[PDB]
Amino acid sequence: ERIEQCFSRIGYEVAEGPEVEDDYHNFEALNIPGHHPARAMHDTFYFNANMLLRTHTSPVQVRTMESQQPPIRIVCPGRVYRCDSDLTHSPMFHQVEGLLVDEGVSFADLKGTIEEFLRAFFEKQLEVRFRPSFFPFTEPSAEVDIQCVICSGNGWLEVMGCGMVHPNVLRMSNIDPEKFQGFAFGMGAERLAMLRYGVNDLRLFFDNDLRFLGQFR
Amino acid sequence: ERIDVTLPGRGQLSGGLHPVTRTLERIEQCFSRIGYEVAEGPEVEDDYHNFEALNIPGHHPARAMHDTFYFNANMLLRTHTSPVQVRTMESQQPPIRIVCPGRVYRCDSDLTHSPMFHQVEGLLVDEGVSFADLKGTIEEFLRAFFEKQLEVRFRPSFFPFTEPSAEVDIQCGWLEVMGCGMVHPNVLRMSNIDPEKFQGFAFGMGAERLAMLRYGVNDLRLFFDNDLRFLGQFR
Amino acid sequence: RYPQARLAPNNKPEARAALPLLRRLLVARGYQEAITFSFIDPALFELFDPGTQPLTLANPISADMAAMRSSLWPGLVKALQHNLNRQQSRVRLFESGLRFVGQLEGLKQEAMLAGAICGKRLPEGWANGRDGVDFFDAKADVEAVLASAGALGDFSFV
Amino acid sequence: MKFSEKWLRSWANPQVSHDELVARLSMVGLEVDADLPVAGAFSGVVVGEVLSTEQHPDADKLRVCQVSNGSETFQVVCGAPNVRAGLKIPFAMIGAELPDDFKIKKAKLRGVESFGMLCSAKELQISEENAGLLELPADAPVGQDVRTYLELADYTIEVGLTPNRGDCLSLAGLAREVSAIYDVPLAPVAVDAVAAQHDETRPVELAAPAACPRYLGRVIRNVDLSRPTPLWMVERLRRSDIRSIDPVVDVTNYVMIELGQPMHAFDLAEINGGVRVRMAEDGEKLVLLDGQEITLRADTLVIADHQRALAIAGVMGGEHSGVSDSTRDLFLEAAFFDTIALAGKARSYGLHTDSSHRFERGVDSQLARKAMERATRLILDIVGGEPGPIVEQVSEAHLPKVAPITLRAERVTQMLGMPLDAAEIVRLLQALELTVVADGEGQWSVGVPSHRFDISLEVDLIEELARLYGYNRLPVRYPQARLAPNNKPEARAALPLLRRLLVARGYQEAITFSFIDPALFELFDPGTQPLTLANPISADMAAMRSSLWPGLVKALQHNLNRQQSRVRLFESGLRFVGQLEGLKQEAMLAGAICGKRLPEGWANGRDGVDFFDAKADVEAVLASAGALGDFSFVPGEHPALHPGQTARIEREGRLVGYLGALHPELAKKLDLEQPVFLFELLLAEVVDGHLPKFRELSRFPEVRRDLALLVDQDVPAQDILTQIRAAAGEWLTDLRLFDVYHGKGIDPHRKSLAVGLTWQHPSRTLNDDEVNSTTQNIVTSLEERFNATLR
Numbered sequence A: 001e002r003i004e005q006c007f008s009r010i011g012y013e014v015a016e017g018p019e020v021e022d023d024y025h026n027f028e029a030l031n032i033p034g035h036h037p038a039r040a041m042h043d044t045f046y047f048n049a050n051m052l053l054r055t056h057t058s059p060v061q062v063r064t065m066e067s068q069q070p071p072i073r074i075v076c077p078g079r080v081y082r083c084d085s086d087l088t089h090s091p092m093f094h095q096v097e098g099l100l101v102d103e104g105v106s107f108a109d110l111k112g113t114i115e116e117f118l119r120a121f122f123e124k125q126l127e128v129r130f131r132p133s134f135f136p137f138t139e140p141s142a143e144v145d146i147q148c149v150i151c152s153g154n155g156w157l158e159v160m161g162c163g164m165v166h167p168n169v170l171r172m173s174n175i176d177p178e179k180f181q182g183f184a185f186g187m188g189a190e191r192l193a194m195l196r197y198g199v200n201d202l203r204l205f206f207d208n209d210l211r212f213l214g215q216f217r
Numbered sequence B: 001e002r003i004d005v006t007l008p009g010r011g012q013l014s015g016g017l018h019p020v021t022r023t024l025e026r027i028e029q030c031f032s033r034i035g036y037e038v039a040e041g042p043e044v045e046d047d048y049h050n051f052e053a054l055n056i057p058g059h060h061p062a063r064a065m066h067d068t069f070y071f072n073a074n075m076l077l078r079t080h081t082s083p084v085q086v087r088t089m090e091s092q093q094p095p096i097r098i099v100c101p102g103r104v105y106r107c108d109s110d111l112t113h114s115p116m117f118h119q120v121e122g123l124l125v126d127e128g129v130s131f132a133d134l135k136g137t138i139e140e141f142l143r144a145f146f147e148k149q150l151e152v153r154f155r156p157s158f159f160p161f162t163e164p165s166a167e168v169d170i171q172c173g174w175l176e177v178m179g180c181g182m183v184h185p186n187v188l189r190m191s192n193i194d195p196e197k198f199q200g201f202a203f204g205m206g207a208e209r210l211a212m213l214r215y216g217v218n219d220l221r222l223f224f225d226n227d228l229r230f231l232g233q234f235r
Numbered sequence C: 001r002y003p004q005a006r007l008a009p010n011n012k013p014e015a016r017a018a019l020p021l022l023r024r025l026l027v028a029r030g031y032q033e034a035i036t037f038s039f040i041d042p043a044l045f046e047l048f049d050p051g052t053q054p055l056t057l058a059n060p061i062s063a064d065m066a067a068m069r070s071s072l073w074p075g076l077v078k079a080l081q082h083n084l085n086r087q088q089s090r091v092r093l094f095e096s097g098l099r100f101v102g103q104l105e106g107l108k109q110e111a112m113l114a115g116a117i118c119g120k121r122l123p124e125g126w127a128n129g130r131d132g133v134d135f136f137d138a139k140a141d142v143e144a145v146l147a148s149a150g151a152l153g154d155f156s157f158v
Numbered sequence D: 001m002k003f004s005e006k007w008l009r010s011w012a013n014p015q016v017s018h019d020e021l022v023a024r025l026s027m028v029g030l031e032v033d034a035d036l037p038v039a040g041a042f043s044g045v046v047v048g049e050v051l052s053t054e055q056h057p058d059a060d061k062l063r064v065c066q067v068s069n070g071s072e073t074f075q076v077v078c079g080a081p082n083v084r085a086g087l088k089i090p091f092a093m094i095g096a097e098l099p100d101d102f103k104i105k106k107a108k109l110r111g112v113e114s115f116g117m118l119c120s121a122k123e124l125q126i127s128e129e130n131a132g133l134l135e136l137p138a139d140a141p142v143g144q145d146v147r148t149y150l151e152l153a154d155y156t157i158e159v160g161l162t163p164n165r166g167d168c169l170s171l172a173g174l175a176r177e178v179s180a181i182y183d184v185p186l187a188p189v190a191v192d193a194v195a196a197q198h199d200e201t202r203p204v205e206l207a208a209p210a211a212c213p214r215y216l217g218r219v220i221r222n223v224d225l226s227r228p229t230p231l232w233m234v235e236r237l238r239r240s241d242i243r244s245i246d247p248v249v250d251v252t253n254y255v256m257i258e259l260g261q262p263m264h265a266f267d268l269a270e271i272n273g274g275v276r277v278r279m280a281e282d283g284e285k286l287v288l289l290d291g292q293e294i295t296l297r298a299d300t301l302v303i304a305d306h307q308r309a310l311a312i313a314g315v316m317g318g319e320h321s322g323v324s325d326s327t328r329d330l331f332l333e334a335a336f337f338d339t340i341a342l343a344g345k346a347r348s349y350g351l352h353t354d355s356s357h358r359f360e361r362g363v364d365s366q367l368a369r370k371a372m373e374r375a376t377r378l379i380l381d382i383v384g385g386e387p388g389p390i391v392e393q394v395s396e397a398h399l400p401k402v403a404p405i406t407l408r409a410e411r412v413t414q415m416l417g418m419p420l421d422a423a424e425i426v427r428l429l430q431a432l433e434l435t436v437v438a439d440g441e442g443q444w445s446v447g448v449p450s451h452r453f454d455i456s457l458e459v460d461l462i463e464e465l466a467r468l469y470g471y472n473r474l475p476v477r478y479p480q481a482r483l484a485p486n487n488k489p490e491a492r493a494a495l496p497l498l499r500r501l502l503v504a505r506g507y508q509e510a511i512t513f514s515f516i517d518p519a520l521f522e523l524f525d526p527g528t529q530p531l532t533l534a535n536p537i538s539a540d541m542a543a544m545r546s547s548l549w550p551g552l553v554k555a556l557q558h559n560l561n562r563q564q565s566r567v568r569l570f571e572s573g574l575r576f577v578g579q580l581e582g583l584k585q586e587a588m589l590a591g592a593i594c595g596k597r598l599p600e601g602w603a604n605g606r607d608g609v610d611f612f613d614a615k616a617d618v619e620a621v622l623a624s625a626g627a628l629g630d631f632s633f634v635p636g637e638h639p640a641l642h643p644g645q646t647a648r649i650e651r652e653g654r655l656v657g658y659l660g661a662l663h664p665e666l667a668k669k670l671d672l673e674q675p676v677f678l679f680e681l682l683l684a685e686v687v688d689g690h691l692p693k694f695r696e697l698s699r700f701p702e703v704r705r706d707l708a709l710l711v712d713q714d715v716p717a718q719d720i721l722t723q724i725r726a727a728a729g730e731w732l733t734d735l736r737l738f739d740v741y742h743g744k745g746i747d748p749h750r751k752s753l754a755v756g757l758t759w760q761h762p763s764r765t766l767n768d769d770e771v772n773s774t775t776q777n778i779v780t781s782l783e784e785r786f787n788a789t790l791r
Ligand SMILES: CNC(=O)COc1cccc(Nc2cc(Cl)ccn2)c1
Pocket: A030, A058, A059, A061, A062, A095, A097, A098, A099, A135, A137, A138, A159, A160, A161, A162, A163, A164, A165, A166, A169, A184, A185, A186, A187, A188
């Protein structure tokens, strides 16, 4: 609710989609080729060869890009699924992804958006660091770090990823990369909640113990 | 053996909000979703914030005791929420994007008019603001508010605080629903805002008038009686 | 045209009980929202605020609308008894708005949330007890409001 | 990718400290995962030579040694089993400071004087080898500090590479980056061509030139495979996490880690008439060097001879064709395999090698020759032999070729939010080995080097500039937007509103797994086939939920087992109804309650929660958008619910959901000894409501009449209330059922319904005659419809 509010107050629309998705919306449309390890059964939950459980909320952004022409300003919260299960990782979790597609969007616009979001979210004028990373769906891409001001026990912490939407991603969804530029970002809701509330064990989120839940009234 | 019927549920159920509160919230939401901040101010104001700062000269009939409620020569009950926009313009330099809902007061007595009522005023002050920007804002507001792609008409009017000014009509053969205009240079200048660098638009509307249009309310006096037979209809 | 804006993500702190949140809670707790005149009868003002000189209007609409309210209670009680006189038994009202404390020099205009209840604890129904509302029913409503931003322990009823 | 910093600095030295280098690497896109010292700290330890050993005359486990430091001969008593004349060892002199504050002093061990100590790798924190003294190369410089000789003032840096930086899977790759980052000279290893000593070759055939456009082969005769891998190579491989196995594998691994070129050596005797680089025949079998028997597919590139397949090209060699102890002659291979043709091929056979990784990520297509010469020199140095000429088979048509990219200065300024100077742009791109040529004003034609597989577009060039300029040095702007006022309809009950209402009504929000146990699914949904996962995490998380109830009930009993009595939970989320073809993914709001109606308190009744408490919660949700009257609670049945306490909820005959007590037989099966009340609503059917429509308020009094009605115990109360409204005329304002009596005062199969009827005319007072008339028509209607009687 809090992540959505930071963007919805500035023109972003809340977009939702199905949790049972197809290879196209979940992978192909996001510049993830068929031979990419993300598509394997070691990471992705499958029903058949083409139908799966979405590994991210980006398919929702894809469905938006197909349905309409720019400007697009959307935030996509939702349940996402991954095979990797144990401590530090759950087979089901939540993430919030964002997308802005307009005529003159820059990496400067993205840095500003992300920096002000984290500041608004954590209610502090904290330091925000951008490290060059990689994602098939963005170029340039960045991993975003914040200071340890919200601790590791309640000098940098990785909290989210972002980048400029890849030309092939726009082109595939019938958006001219020559006329339109865009940025997109993603974050894990549980990771953020743990940072905010001083939660140590991620497994506490899915047990629904009243002795846990009651602490958030 | 232990069967039962589906009778009403046990206990207390929900009450509800007042139609004006529903309307105010709705008007705020149309702007707050696009960058506007909700600004509030005092209901007991001074001549300066209520009149002088808004280009209303001392000899103007609006200032008279036939229309304005006074405590002494300089202190009054605000006749509009514009003093809040004035206090904002004094406190900060542009950009300003604000919506000002609130209780306002006027001497004018009975039937079509109450001595206390609510209004929502808006203000946008930036570097390159035009009358085209204002037309778009207002047209899209009314469409969002009334949930219809209705026809919007702008008639040239007059206000001391704006130039050019307009009275805004909607269909249902037309209905006047609000007023707006480009902020007067003297209004900006008085609040230390260079009219050469900054332009602005402002608008105003009555919440009760809007609620009546929306909910089919005939008598404006029903709003301040708080009859449960009235209130209950807005749950 | 639609005005352009360089807008940045922003939000208010999480741990805060705003009035829109509080209104909806009172709605859920079986209250109807009232809006009363900020100016009341000086006689009524004196009943609720003995010894205080009200901030009086120079040109009031009528003499019974001369005094700026120092409480939302005279208005709330009057709306309550307006309903009681109109065949209503269970009246549960709340109002938010300014209070006017002091004379012009030093005047305080503070936003209040006030509530007024009467009649049966529960609405008339086959499954509901026929007990009249009391202090502890109103206390629960105050407790629920006071706990809205996870700070109930910061308050004390003395 | 792990590496020695000393080795990296020998190619490109950034003139900054270790800490500064590790900091910058992550800041330019090479995230450092670890930076560790190669050894423990110590001083006073030099290279020593054992001149002679004698048996200690008073301790059999000890030896009396004469050790030289190149300047002087010292007597040292040693107990290590490997101590012998001629051995080059670390000599810790009197004065030497070893790890964990161990100072070497003078000693008289069993009557014999000792002027130092000879060390094990363990004693020096070099290795965990305490088996004996750290044996040093026969040619070690005696007297030199052991830290200097063994290059122990070093760190190993581990970088977690992104899939686009396959070029950094080598010291050559990483050093080129450093040279760019720091704008410093790059001194790559000078690789002189090794001259052929004979003319023996083997033919090479490129039968699949699109999968392998270049293949280099070389005969190396009379190699002595019994010879050891030199220490400098063992340490360089070890500092890159490569374990030393045998001289030939060590060289090919070393060449790969140094230059980025995976290589392979075959036993020449195991090659029947020349090399054939071809696709596998479908079902062709190959036993790998690790013993795995792979059944190949026609899409897989193999290195074959004229008889059979020898290796799976670019991934792993075969057992038969590989080097063994019996090997006397080698056939070296250095090839370029196309990335696309090799993509996911190792994974499909369940394999992953350093070679498969590098070829899939991309190996410089021009590198094979330099690497071949390098590996030859190393083989001749380590195991001897005689090299023949290099056989290079190449397909010019299939060599990778990336068209020049035009980069526009205005596109860099737009993206970065600031302009970069033409000189800075050129310098930065040239450092990465890109070919930059001016193409007019604020435009360049940029050529991509053969080691880069991630650069094909203008935006990739902009990334390179941003990366090396510094992401955090770039400006910060907020995106522009032509925003217009907008809003959603007023008369709608959104889920955020509903959650808060349930919170206010004393509910705690739960989040449960969307996939449940098929056994649990079958209890709540008998006979329905769940949408089952193909690869579930476990078998008890195989079924996609068709209800939020199994999860809600399970979380409820989780709490009941944790000393909770009053559990009131709600959850929102998707339902999965049907199989893939025709699947329905509907958002639901479901709730589950148990225990006392009210929390324990002095002022609270101690009654247990029932159906009507859950009903009130549903009613409150259903009335959230002013459309309560659009819904109806009809006696229904659900397999998970008690058939006597179940309401089917509808809107215009359409199913909204169900409300009821959890079936006592389901409770038994779950070992739940408390009554539980459940509801589940289809949010798409609850969200829409109606906007208030003002109805005029009467200035006139209302009239109330109370009716006590005797009806059959089973006739539904809402059927009677509905009939009353129908027969009460135009002026009824309120109808209330204030009591139900099923006592002794009446028949045991009947019930008394006490109803309050209120009428108000909008324009006048109502007279008693008309109200009594209206009341009689209600009664008459109830007599003719339900055989009702007045009490
Ligand atoms: C949990 N997520 C993370 O840490 C980082 O997520 C990211 C990073 C960058 C982009 C995106 N999403 C995206 C979606 C479209 Cl449709 C196009 C381009 N990108 C998500």
